[PDB]
Every structure is written in structure tokens, then in C-alpha cells.
Write a protein that binds this ligand. Structure first.
Ligand SMILES: *[C@H](CCCCCCCCCCCCCCC)CC(=O)[C@@H](*)C(=O)SCCNC(=O)CCNC(=O)[C@H](O)C(C)(C)COP(=O)(O)OP(=O)(O)OC[C@H]1O[C@@H](n2cnc3c(N)ncnc32)[C@H](O)[C@@H]1OP(=O)(O)O
Ligand SMILES: *[C@H](CCCCCCCCCCCCCCC)CC(=O)[C@@H](*)C(=O)SCCNC(=O)CCNC(=O)[C@H](O)C(C)(C)COP(=O)(O)OP(=O)(O)OC[C@H]1O[C@@H](n2cnc3c(N)ncnc32)[C@H](O)[C@@H]1OP(=O)(O)O
Ligand SMILES: CCCCCCC(CCCCCC)(CO[C@H]1O[C@@H](CO)[C@H](O)[C@@H](O)[C@@H]1O)CO[C@H]1O[C@@H](CO)[C@H](O)[C@@H](O)[C@@H]1O
Ligand SMILES: CCCCCCC(CCCCCC)(CO[C@H]1O[C@@H](CO)[C@H](O)[C@@H](O)[C@@H]1O)CO[C@H]1O[C@@H](CO)[C@H](O)[C@@H](O)[C@@H]1O
Ligand SMILES: CCCCCCC(CCCCCC)(CO[C@H]1O[C@@H](CO)[C@H](O)[C@@H](O)[C@@H]1O)CO[C@H]1O[C@@H](CO)[C@H](O)[C@@H](O)[C@@H]1O
Ligand SMILES: CCCCCCC(CCCCCC)(CO[C@H]1O[C@@H](CO)[C@H](O)[C@@H](O)[C@@H]1O)CO[C@H]1O[C@@H](CO)[C@H](O)[C@@H](O)[C@@H]1O
Ligand SMILES: [Cl-]
Ligand SMILES: [Cl-]
Lengths: 254, 256
């Protein structure tokens, strides 16, 4: 009965039949990065994945630039008001482009699971934190419902902003993968964390408009609450990160 | 428990409800049980109680008590030397430090008196006022403030109490005026301005407590309270935005 409200446009798309295939994948991911992986790496030397990391980070930067451009050309730069933007459920070329860009953003969350696989294989267990695993699990898991029910409108603003910030974030990760010699020039590490914090604030301020807009016909109000609560959860997790990494100096720039 | 209680503030040891978190957990368990289950069941086959005079007296008392607690928070540090940045707890037995610890305990105790709001809802059969937002707030605020009085009764952790007592002067004046009757409720056109004040309060509390995460060399003794205050101010901001949405944007509880 609940699946009768799903967008029929995404029915045949990869992983969109039911939430079960992604729950199995993410269950195996959580099991691997927190339990199986570190156990298998315990009596092994770390893997040398410098070239794999550099190629991966470069691909994510270009893929994020592409998804940002597609979100701009699917609505955000061609008519969206930045207030009550509703989903367009028609089979028009522009409405399908916005739906497919949401699907692409969702799929990119599964590719970004490789971040945690690199941490495990490189034996960087200090980077497998609650903040990282929680974010990398709940972002794709919840975005399945966004692609399935509301692939467009005001619910995609945080994705437009996130793909633009992930261009800076994975350029930092790409530059840091070059080695300890190149990490000394990444003095602006704290400015990237500030950008991520400012991103959650802007996402919360944008989605908060939903609660005040009379006659807003955005079709799935529950996503305003999810977006608002998740941006608060990440703002708290990233403020705890800022506190131990910089205020307490556990992960200062090199 | 015995090792964790070795960090408790000995100044508050003998104070009412401060021996252990157990007496307040029993009281709040009975309150949650009463307002969500027992009370409404007993009122189901009864006429509502006429508590107009009891409500007016209670709201008037809470307004004066909030003015008093606000004044005491101002005279215990906020208006006499607190920087509004890294204000550490003063654990000495100096007159100002004890006055701050006293005011925190009074604020904590006032949360138990405020449980009467929900009792008034149940007895008046206003079950639409017994919402998740109300019961959760009224349960979590006193329950958690026991730990604040017990371990850190002062400093930057009390800013939200200074602000909250000042807003509760406006909020219970609204409740007091609406208790006068349907004739007086028509002049309470500013209901949405009070909800805006409550929302702006959570924003200011979050902005103030966020300083903790960035201040180097801040010697505030219980960092865990910075996380609790920030998370609670986010939880209430979300609950009050959902309230604004159904009460005003969808018109379920518009001013009269
Ligand atoms: C999160 C999304 C938020 C969304 C907004 C809220 C609303 C959501 C609603 C969802 C539901 C909607 C429903 C639908 C409605 C329609 C952001 C996001 O998407 C991507 C992110 O990655 S954010 C999380 C990542 N962060 C962390 O893991 C840790 C937190 N720290 C930071 O983010 C920092 O600010 C910083 C980016 C600077 C990283 O700091 P650090 O943790 O301290 O890291 P290091 O400086 O050590 O990193 C250098 C080391 O990492 C190695 N390296 C390089 N490349 C990689 C890769 N790709 N993987 C792993 N490791 C890598 C370097 O080699 C170096 O290690 P070495 O040992 O050589 O020193
Ligand atoms: C919460 C605290 C925030 C703290 C900051 C965050 C961080 C905290 C960290 C804690 C941990 C720290 C650890 C230690 C550190 C060292 C706020 C607070 O303290 C007090 C409050 O009361 S806030 C919540 C109350 N609100 C609600 O219940 C519902 C939400 N709505 C609102 O708030 C509204 O903005 C408004 C105030 C306008 C009320 O709206 P409404 O719910 O729509 O109400 P009505 O207009 O219907 O009410 C009128 C009816 O109520 C009757 N009435 C009058 N007086 C009373 C009383 N006292 N009790 C019950 N009923 C009453 C009137 O007669 C009228 O009914 P009638 O049938 O006659 O028309
Ligand atoms: C992806 C984001 C980071 C890009 C970094 C750009 C990179 C390094 C390139 C190599 C990167 C490692 C593979 C280009 O910068 C170089 O560009 C040359 C152009 O020919 C200039 O002639 C040279 O002087 C300059 O430093 C450094 O940028 C900055 O460096 C500052 C001094 O720390 C400079 O004050 C600043 O202005 C410059 O912008
Ligand atoms: C295409 C060739 C690019 C070479 C660029 C070298 C790079 C950046 C490295 C970035 C590494 C990527 C993560 C080293 O830059 C740094 O070098 C340090 C010494 O190690 C200095 O202590 C530091 O202050 C300097 O910024 C920038 O160097 C130059 O930038 C010029 C501004 O046009 C300066 O006028 C120039 O004189 C400086 O030298
Ligand atoms: C939210 C954080 C964003 C950080 C953006 C920083 C970013 C990209 C801007 O980089 C640009 O900087 C321009 C100068 O302003 C140059 O003209 C341009 O070539 C360069 O790409 C890289 O710039 C820095 O790169 C350092 C070497 O890693 C340099 O040592 C540093 O001193 C430089 O500042
Ligand atoms: C057990 C009785 C006999 C010993 C007396 C100890 C002494 C006085 C010491 C005087 C100086 C001696 C050189 C410590 O007293 C102080 O000690 C401070 C440091 O811990 C506390 O911060 C402070 O609150 C306490 O009053 C008073 O003990 C009691 O005082 C109570 C309040 O009258 C306290 O609530 C109680 O718990 C404490 O047991
Ligand atoms: Cl962390
Ligand atoms: Cl509500």
C-alpha cells in the first residue's frame, strides 16, 4: 500500500525495485569496515593504494562537478525559486533529467563507500569513526526513498550544495594522497571543515522555509523533517570532529 | 555508579532531590504514566474540571518565579562578570558561586512544578495539548537538569536557563491571559510572535553553546554538557518548527 505512492519513472532503475538489496549491501559494508576487514588486516601489512586513491579522488571530483552541473541544468539554475520547488513527476526531458541526477547522486553514495575500504586496507582505523560510518551508511540508505518517491524539487537542494562541497573535499583528499611531503602544503584543512559546517547550516536554513510556507504543494513533507534533522545530526558530529581534531589538536593540518 | 558519583559537586549533596537520580526517575515515570495513560483513562467517562482560577494563580506564580530566577541568574554571574564565552563552573563556597548553584537547583525544581501544565491539560480534557513535544520537553528538561545541578551548577551551561526563564515570563503571561476565558483570548493576536521568540531562543542557545567546540584553552569542566545543550536545542527547534507548521501553516491552532 505504501509502495503505491512511488514514482513509476524510476521502477526499472538499478537498486530501485525495493529497499532490500541496498540494506543487504550496506549491512555487509558496516560488517566489513567495523568487524571483518580490521580482523583480516590485523596480522597483515597495510596495502599501498596511493595511485588507486589519487585516481579515485580525481574521479569523485569530476563526477561531483558533473552532478552539480546536472542539478543546476535539471532545475536549480533554470527556474527553481529556492523556496517551494515541488517535484515534477512528468516524463518530460527536463523532469526525467532531474530524476536521473537524483539516482546518480544516490549511486555515488555507494561508490563513496570505497573511502572506508581504503581506511581498512591502509590500516587507518582512526579514520573509521562513528561520524564517517554513520554518514556513509545513512546517506545512501535514506536517499533510496528520495529517488523512489520525490526525485526533484526542494528536497534536492542539499545534494546540489553537497556535490559542490565534495569538489573541494575530494580535491583535499586527492592532494593528501600524494604523500606526507605534499600534506605540508594543505594548511587550509580547517577552512574545508568550516565549509562543511556552513553547508549544514545553509541546508537547515533552506529546508526550514518548508515549515512556514503556506500553500506549498511539495508532495512529501516528511523529507523536510528528515533533511532538517540530518543536517542537525551532521552539524553536531562535525562540531565534535572540529573539537577533537583542532581545538584538542588530534588531527591538525601537517 | 560509585566511581562516577565521586565527581559530583559536594555543595548540593543535602539539597532536595539531589541524593541520587532515582527519586526523580520514579516521579517522572509516574508523571509520564499519568498524563499519557492513567489520567486520560480516568477522565474518559467524566466531565472536565473547572480550573480557571487554579490556572490563573499558577500562571501568575510561574511568571513571578521566572522573573525571580532570571534576576538570580543575572546576579549570580551573567550580569556581573560572565564573559558570555568560556564561563567555567565556580565550585568554591564563595557567596556568588553558591548563589549560582542555588539558582540552578531552583531552575531544576521549577521543572517539577511545571509538570502541573500537563496535569491541567488532562483534568480539563484538552488531550490535543498532550503532544509528544510537550511531554518529551517536560520529562527530559528536569531529568537531565539533575546532572547539571549535581555536576556543573554554573558557567556556560546555565546560559540557556537565563534565556529560558526570561522567555517563560512571556509564555506564562500568554497562558495566564488565555486562562481568563474566550472573551480575553481574542486580544491574544500575538500568539505567533511568542512561538517565534521560542524558536529564536533555541537558535541563540545553539549559537552560544557552539563556541565551546572552537575555544582553545577553555577550562569548562564538563564538555559532555556542551553536546547535550546543542543536541537538545536542535531537537526542540525541530519539534517547534513541526508545531509552527501544523498550528499556523496548516491552521490547526491559530490565534483566536
Ligand atoms: C555528508 C552529507 C550531508 C548531507 C546534508 C544533510 C541532509 C541529508 C538528508 C539525506 C536524506 C534525504 C532524503 C531525500 C529527499 C529527497 C557529506 C558527504 O556527502 C561526503 C563526505 O565525505 S562528508 C564525511 C567525511 N568526513 C570524514 O570521514 C571525517 C570528518 N572530517 C572531515 O570531513 C574533515 O573536514 C576533512 C575533510 C578535512 C577530513 O579530515 P580528517 O578526517 O582528519 O582526514 P585526514 O586529513 O587525515 O585525511 C588525509 C588522509 O586520508 C587519506 N586518503 C586520501 N584519499 C582517501 C580516500 N578517498 N579514502 C580514504 N583515505 C583517503 C590520505 O592518504 C591521508 O592518509 P595518510 O595515512 O596518507 O596520512
Ligand atoms: C523548553 C526548554 C528549552 C531549553 C533550551 C534547550 C537546551 C536545554 C538543555 C537541557 C539540559 C542541560 C543539562 C545541564 C546543563 C548544566 C521550554 C520551556 O522551558 C517551557 C515551555 O513551556 S516550552 C513548551 C510548551 N509548549 C507546548 O506545550 C506546545 C508548543 N506551543 C507553544 O509553545 C506555543 O508557542 C504557545 C506558547 C503559544 C502555546 O501554543 P498552543 O500549544 O497552541 O497553546 P494554546 O494557545 O492552545 O493554549 C491556550 C490554552 O491553554 C490553557 N491554559 C492556560 N494556562 C495553562 C496552563 N498553565 N496549563 C494548561 N493549560 C493552560 C488556556 O486556558 C487555553 O485553553 P482553553 O481551552 O481555555 O482555550
Ligand atoms: C587542486 C587544488 C590545489 C591547486 C594548487 C595549485 C598550485 C600547485 C600546483 C601543483 C599541485 C600538486 C600536484 C599552483 O600554484 C603554482 O602555479 C604556477 C602556475 O604555473 C605558478 O607559477 C606558481 O608560482 C604557483 O605556486 C599551488 O597554488 C598556490 O600556491 C601558493 C603558494 O603556496 C601561491 O601563493 C598561490 O598563488 C598558488 O595559487
Ligand atoms: C607547476 C609548479 C608548481 C610549484 C608550486 C610550489 C608551491 C606550491 C606547492 C603546492 C603543493 C601541493 C599540495 C610551493 O610553495 C611553498 O613552498 C614552501 C617551501 O617548501 C614555502 O615555505 C611556502 O611558503 C611556499 O608557499 C608554490 O610555490 C611558489 O608560489 C609562488 C606564488 O606564485 C611564490 O611566489 C613562490 O616563491 C613559491 O615558492
Ligand atoms: C573552503 C576551502 C577552500 C580552499 C581553496 C584553496 C585552493 C584550492 C585555492 O587555489 C587557487 O588559489 C588562487 C589564489 O587565490 C590561485 O590563483 C589558483 O591558481 C589556485 O588554484 C588552493 O589554494 C592554496 O593551495 C595551497 C597548496 O595546496 C597553497 O599553499 C595556498 O597558499 C593556496 O592558497
Ligand atoms: C567529614 C567531616 C570532617 C572533615 C571536614 C572537611 C571539610 C572541612 C575542611 C576544612 C579544612 C581542613 C584543612 C571539607 O570541606 C570542603 O571541602 C571542599 C574540598 O573537597 C569541598 O569542595 C567543599 O564543598 C567542602 O565543604 C568539611 O567537610 C564537609 O563539609 C560539608 C559542607 O559544610 C560538605 O558538604 C561535605 O561533603 C564535607 O565532607
Ligand atoms: Cl570524529
Ligand atoms: Cl506539536
Amino acid at each position: 500500500n505504501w509502495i503505491k505512492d512511488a514514482d513509476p519513472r524510476v521502477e526499472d532503475w538499478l537498486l530501485m525495485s525495493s529497499p532490500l538489496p541496498q540494506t543487504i549491501l550496506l549491512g555487509f559494508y558496516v560488517y566489513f569496515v567495523t568487524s571483518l576487514g580490521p580482523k583480516l588486516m590485523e596480522n597483515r601489512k597495510p596495502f599501498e593504494l596511493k595511485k588507486a586513491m589519487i585516481t579515485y579522488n580525481f574521479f569523485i571530483v569530476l563526477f561531483s562537478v558533473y552532478m552539480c552541473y546536472e542539478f543546476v541544468m535539471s532545475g536549480w539554475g533554470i527556474g527553481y525559486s529556492f523556496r517551494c520547488d515541488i517535484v515534477d513527476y512528468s516524463r518530460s526531458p527536463t523532469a526525467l533529467r532531474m530524476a536521473r541526477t537524483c539516482w546518480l547522486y544516490y549511486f555515488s553514495k555507494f561508490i563513496e563507500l570505497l573511502d572506508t575500504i581504503f581506511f581498512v586496507l591502509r590500516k587507518k582505523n582512526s579514520q573509521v569513526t562513528f561520524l564517517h560510518v554513520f554518514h556513509h551508511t545513512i546517506m545512501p540508505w535514506t536517499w533510496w526513498f528520495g529517488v523512489k518517491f520525490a526525485a526533484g524539487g526542494l528536497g534536492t537542494f542539499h545534494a546540489l550544495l553537497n556535490t559542490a562541497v565534495h569538489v573541494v573535499m575530494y580535491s583535499y583528499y586527492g592532494l593528501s594522497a600524494l604523500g606526507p611531503a605534499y600534506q605540508k602544503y594543505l594548511w587550509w584543512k580547517k577552512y574545508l571543515t568550516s565549509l562543511q559546517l556552513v553547508q549544514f547550516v545553509i541546508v537547515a536554513i533552506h529546508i526550514s522555509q518548508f515549515f512556514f510556507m503556506e500553500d506549498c504543494k511539495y508532495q512529501f513533507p516528511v523529507f523536510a523533517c528528515i533533511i532538517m534533522s540530518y543536517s542537525f545530526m551532521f552539524l553536531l558530529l562535525f562540531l565534535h570532529f572540529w573539537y577533537r581534531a583542532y581545538t584538542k589538536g588530534q588531527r591538525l593540518p601537517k
